[PDB]
Amino acid sequence: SAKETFYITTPIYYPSGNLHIGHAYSTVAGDVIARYKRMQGYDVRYLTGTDEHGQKIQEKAQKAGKTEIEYLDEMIAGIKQLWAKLEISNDDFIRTTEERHKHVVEQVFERLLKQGDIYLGEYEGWELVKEESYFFNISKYTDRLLEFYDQNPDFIQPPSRKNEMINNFIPGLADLAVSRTSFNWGVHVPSNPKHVVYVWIDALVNYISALGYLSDDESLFNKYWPADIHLMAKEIVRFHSIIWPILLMALDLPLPKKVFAHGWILMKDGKMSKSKGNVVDPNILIDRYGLDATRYYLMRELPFGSDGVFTPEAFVERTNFDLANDLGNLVNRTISMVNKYFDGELPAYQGPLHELDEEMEAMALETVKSYTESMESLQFSVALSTVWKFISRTNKYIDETTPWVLAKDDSQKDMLGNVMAHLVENIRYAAVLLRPFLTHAPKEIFEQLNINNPQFMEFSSLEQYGVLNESIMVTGQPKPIFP
Numbered sequence: 441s442a443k444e445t446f447y448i449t450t451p452i453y454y455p456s457g458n459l460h461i462g463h464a465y466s467t468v469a470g471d472v473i474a475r476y477k478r479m480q481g482y483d484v485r486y487l488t489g490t491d492e493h494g495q496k497i498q499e500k501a502q503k504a505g506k507t508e509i510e511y512l513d514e515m516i517a518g519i520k521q522l523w524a525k526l527e528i529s530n531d532d533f534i535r536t537t538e539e540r541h542k543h544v545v546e547q548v549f550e551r552l553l554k555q556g557d558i559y560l561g562e563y564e565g566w567e568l569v570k571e572e573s574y575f576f577n578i579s580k581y582t583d584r585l586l587e588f589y590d591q592n593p594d595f596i597q598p599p600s601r602k603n604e605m606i607n608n609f610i611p612g613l614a615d616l617a618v619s620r621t622s623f624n625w626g627v628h629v630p631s632n633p634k635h636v637v638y639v640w641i642d643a644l645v646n647y648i649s650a651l652g653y654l655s656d657d658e659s660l661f662n663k664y665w666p667a668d669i670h671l672m673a674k675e676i677v678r679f680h681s682i683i684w685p686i687l688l689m690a691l692d693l694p695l696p697k698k699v700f701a702h703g704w705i706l707m708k709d710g711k712m713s714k715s716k717g718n719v720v721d722p723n724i725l726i727d728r729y730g731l732d733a734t735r736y737y738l739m740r741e742l743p744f745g746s747d748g749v750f751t752p753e754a755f756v757e758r759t760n761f762d763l764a765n766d767l768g769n770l771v772n773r774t775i776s777m778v779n780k781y782f783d784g785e786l787p788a789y790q791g792p793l794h795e796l797d798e799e800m801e802a803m804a805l806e807t808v809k810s811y812t813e814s815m816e817s818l819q820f821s822v823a824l825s826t827v828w829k830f831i832s833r834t835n836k837y838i839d840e841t842t843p844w845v846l847a848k849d850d851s852q853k854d855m856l857g858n859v860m861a862h863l864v865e866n867i868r869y870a871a872v873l874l875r876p877f878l879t880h881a882p883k884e885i886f887e888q889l890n891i892n893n894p895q896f897m898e899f900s901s902l903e904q905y906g907v908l909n910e911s912i913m914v915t916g917q918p919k920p921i922f923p
């Protein structure tokens with residue numbers, strides 16, 4: 441029967457330079473939710489893309505030996521290579537230079553023009569800037585926007601960022617300057633060609649133009665709109681929670697269910713900034729330490745709901761202590777003992793024979809429950825720390841049971857077998873819960889454990905502890921799961 445749809449977007453990034461781990465956080469965060477939602481059985485569409493118009497791109501191609509589009513084709517090639525390297529599961533990549541997007545920018549602008557929502561005037565702002573500009577009279581939608589906030593109190597996440605937008609910006613909404621005559625690289629206004637559509641309407645409509653809105657084929661739009669989550673950093677929350685819902689109202693379209701804004705990755709001299717220069721290249725981190733380590737650090741160290749500071753030391757600690765030592769060596773210790781004592785034949789689960797087992801089994805279920813809650817509220821660092829509490833417990837379980845003492849007594853084979861059974865089932869739980877986060881390690885762990893039944897790699901298989909009630913042969917050549 442038809443799966444419920446879940447549409448998740450990242451912001452479209454500005455290719456005026458190389459992307460850094462700030463951009464990678466948003467795209468990996470989106471990828472984790474997408475993979476998670478697919479595992480829950482949703483019909484997922486995950487969109488990312490590039491904002492390719494503006495004076496900046498013009499300058500960056502002019503201050504180089506190329507046309508805007510040959511420059512942009514180069515940068516986007518590099519961005520798609522990065523997402524490919526990060527194993528981002530985006531279902532589409534929207535570019536604002538492609539016809540499906542530009543068509544929507546022209547028609548949306550002309551529609552608001554014809555409705556009278558956009559009118560011609562002059563912008564006067566701050567050096568002194570003064571030029572003819574089309575204005576979007578958003579002020580008129582103020583009352584309707586506050587009613588939407590009243591009916592959708594969970595619209596902005598986390599809730600901190602909401603009361604700010606309302607307290608600070610909504611004073612009164614001033615008419616938004618939505619066009620300029622001062623540059624030419626962008627979508628020109630059909631009814632006034634010397635006008636070029638500014639960032640607001642151009643960038644925001646990517647979420648709907650990518651679903652074929654106002655085209656011959658609107659089937660993706662009717663299927664996936666409205667968006668379940670727009671992801672972003674805090675600096676553009678007001679554009680997505682004020683300008684975007686008002687634009688959607690003016691076009692008489694359903695509004696998005698949720699905007700999730702995370703915090704900034706900091707690097708000593710403030711926010712990691714493409715422009716500033718204080719930049720960490722995800723490619724260098726993936727090349728040196730591998731994909732799982734780079735994905736894990738991004739999602740674990742930098743909590744959704746606050747800012748995070750990157751240090752090379754903290755990266756090395758997360759990689760070496762959490763991944764290699766805590767998880768990597770739990771599996772190597774377990775497989776080594778199954779080989780040494782049972783010659784690779786893992787005895788079948790029976791029940792909680794040990795007195796530690798009953799509450800540890802209960803801990804396995806309470807980990808899954810705690811994980812689910814954290815993931816639904818987008819608390820990734822808490823979801824992962826909860827998983828690692830369980831991994832740490834599993835390591836402790838080896839110490840508490842002392843399997844090598846049980847191996848001496850020939851009458852303690854039932855209990856030794858039961859200890860090995862609980863070790864592997866604990867590892868299975870951890871492997872399944874990490875599938876949205878780590879693309880390589882879970883696969884490798886199932887491989888070396890010789891778990892081939894694909895049902896046992898899915899969330900539904902965590903409902904009842906002890907699914908392996910058949911003898912299984914684990915690898916006789918265990919190797920490091922990481923890097």
Ligand SMILES: Nc1ncnc2c1ncn2[C@@H]1O[C@H](COP(=O)(O)OP(=O)(O)OP(=O)(O)O)[C@@H](O)[C@H]1O
Binds near residue numbers: 453466676713714
């Ligand atoms: N330091 C950062 N921390 C977290 N997310 C970031 C960071 N920098 C960029 N992002 C992500 O990328 C988006 C910003 O996109 P953009 O292409 O404008 O890059 P930028 O670094 O903000 O640009 P610039 O440095 O020129 O202001 C954010 O909304 C967020 O999704």
Ligand SMILES: NC1Cc2ccccc2C1
Binds near residue numbers: 492493494637638643
């Ligand atoms: N942020 C940039 C995106 C965009 C699109 C069109 C015109 C200018 C700009 C500025």
